[PDB]
Design an enzyme around this catalytic site. Structure first.
Site, PDB file in Angstrom:
ATOM      1  NE  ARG A  54      -3.672   0.198   2.303  1.00 23.67           N
ATOM      2  CZ  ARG A  54      -4.606   0.854   3.056  1.00 23.67           C
ATOM      3  NH1 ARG A  54      -4.355   0.656   4.417  1.00 23.67           N
ATOM      4  NH2 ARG A  54      -5.641   1.619   2.610  1.00 23.67           N
ATOM      5  CG  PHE A  59      -2.677   7.813   5.113  1.00 29.93           C
ATOM      6  CD1 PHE A  59      -2.443   8.203   6.234  1.00 29.93           C
ATOM      7  CD2 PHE A  59      -3.441   6.635   4.847  1.00 29.93           C
ATOM      8  CE1 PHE A  59      -2.993   7.180   7.504  1.00 29.93           C
ATOM      9  CE2 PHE A  59      -3.853   6.049   5.489  1.00 29.93           C
ATOM     10  CZ  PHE A  59      -3.695   6.244   7.009  1.00 29.93           C
ATOM     11  CD  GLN A  62      -0.572  -1.856   6.044  1.00 29.52           C
ATOM     12  OE1 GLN A  62      -1.308  -1.061   5.995  1.00 29.52           O
ATOM     13  NE2 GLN A  62      -0.821  -3.242   6.073  1.00 29.52           N
ATOM     14  CG  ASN A 101      -3.413  -3.605  14.693  1.00 35.01           C
ATOM     15  OD1 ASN A 101      -4.393  -3.515  14.496  1.00 35.01           O
ATOM     16  ND2 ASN A 101      -2.861  -2.622  15.522  1.00 35.01           N
ATOM     17  CG  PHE A 112       1.353   1.722   9.138  1.00 35.29           C
ATOM     18  CD1 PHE A 112       1.252   0.927   9.995  1.00 35.29           C
ATOM     19  CD2 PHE A 112       1.391   3.298   9.395  1.00 35.29           C
ATOM     20  CE1 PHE A 112       0.250   1.369  11.210  1.00 35.29           C
ATOM     21  CE2 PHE A 112       0.940   3.724  10.583  1.00 35.29           C
ATOM     22  CZ  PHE A 112       0.266   2.891  11.752  1.00 35.29           C
ATOM     23  CG  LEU A 121      -3.574   5.806  12.341  1.00 33.67           C
ATOM     24  CD1 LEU A 121      -2.287   5.487  11.483  1.00 33.67           C
ATOM     25  CD2 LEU A 121      -4.793   5.034  12.015  1.00 33.67           C
ATOM     26  CG  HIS A 125      -2.092   1.019  14.071  1.00 30.82           C
ATOM     27  ND1 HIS A 125      -2.952   1.912  13.900  1.00 30.82           N
ATOM     28  CD2 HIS A 125      -2.210  -0.191  13.293  1.00 30.82           C
ATOM     29  CE1 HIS A 125      -4.048   1.031  12.995  1.00 30.82           C
ATOM     30  NE2 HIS A 125      -3.580  -0.163  12.625  1.00 30.82           N
TER      31      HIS A 125
END
Length: 164
Positions: A54, A59, A62, A101, A112, A121, A125
Site C-alpha cells: 500500500r 498518508f 505499508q 494489525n 507502516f 492512529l 497501532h
C-alpha cells in the site's frame, strides 16, 4: 544504543535509495527487536525481497508481508502474532514507524511509515521508531501510489539490515 536499520528500495526498474530507521528499543524493546531481526533476517526469515503493498500519497506506506505478499499475512519472531507492547509513543509526524494489525494484540511483521501526523492512529497501532534518513526515498514511493493505496509498480525491499 538505539538500533539503526535500513531498507534499500527498488521502484519498478530503478533503485530508489536507502531508508534508514531508528528503533525505539528504550520504549518498546520487544517490538523494536522484532523489526530489527526481520531486517537482518537473523531468525531465518524477514523483509529481504518483501514489498510495500500500500502506498497512499501524503498518508502512509505499508509493507512487510513476507509470507503472503499482499497484506493478508506475516509473522513475528515471537510467533504468528504478538501483544501490543505499549502505546507510549505517538504518531507525531513524517516518518513515524508503526505496526499494522487487525485489532488488539495482533502484531506480526507488517508495518507502516506515516508521511503525515497520523495522530488518529494513536492507541490503535504500536509506534516503535522513525525514519532518520532517506525521507526522499519514502516520498519517491508516491510516484507509484494512489488515493486508494493501490501500488502501480513493484516497490521492493531489495536489501535490508542493521547499521553501526
Amino acid at each position: 544504543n538505539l538500533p539503526r536499520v535500513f531498507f534499500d528500495i527498488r521502484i519498478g526498474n530503478g533503485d530508489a535509495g536507502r531508508i534508514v530507521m531508528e528503533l525505539r528499543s528504550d520504549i518498546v524493546p520487544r517490538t523494536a527487536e522484532n523489526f530489527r531481526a526481520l531486517c537482518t533476517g537473523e531468525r531465518g526469515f524477514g523483509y529481504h525481497n518483501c514489498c510495500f503493498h500500500r502506498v497512499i500519497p501524503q498518508f502512509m506506506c505499508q509493507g512487510g508481508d513476507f509470507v503472503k505478499g499482499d497484506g493478508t499475512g506475516g509473522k513475528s519472531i515471537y510467533g504468528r502474532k504478538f501483544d501490543d507492547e505499549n502505546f507510549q509513543l505517538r504518531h507525531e509526524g513524517f516518518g513515524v514507524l508503526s505496526m499494522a494489525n487487525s485489532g488488539p494484540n495482533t502484531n506480526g511483521s507488517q508495518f507502516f511509515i506515516c508521511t503525515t501526523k497520523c495522530d488518529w492512529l494513536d492507541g490503535k497501532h504500536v509506534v516503535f521508531g522513525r525514519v532518520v534518513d532517506g525521507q526522499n526515498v519514502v516520498k519517491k514511493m508516491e510516484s507509484v501510489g494512489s488515493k486508494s493505496g493501490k501500488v502501480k509498480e513493484p516497490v521492493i525491499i531489495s536489501r535490508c539490515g542493521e547499521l553501526i
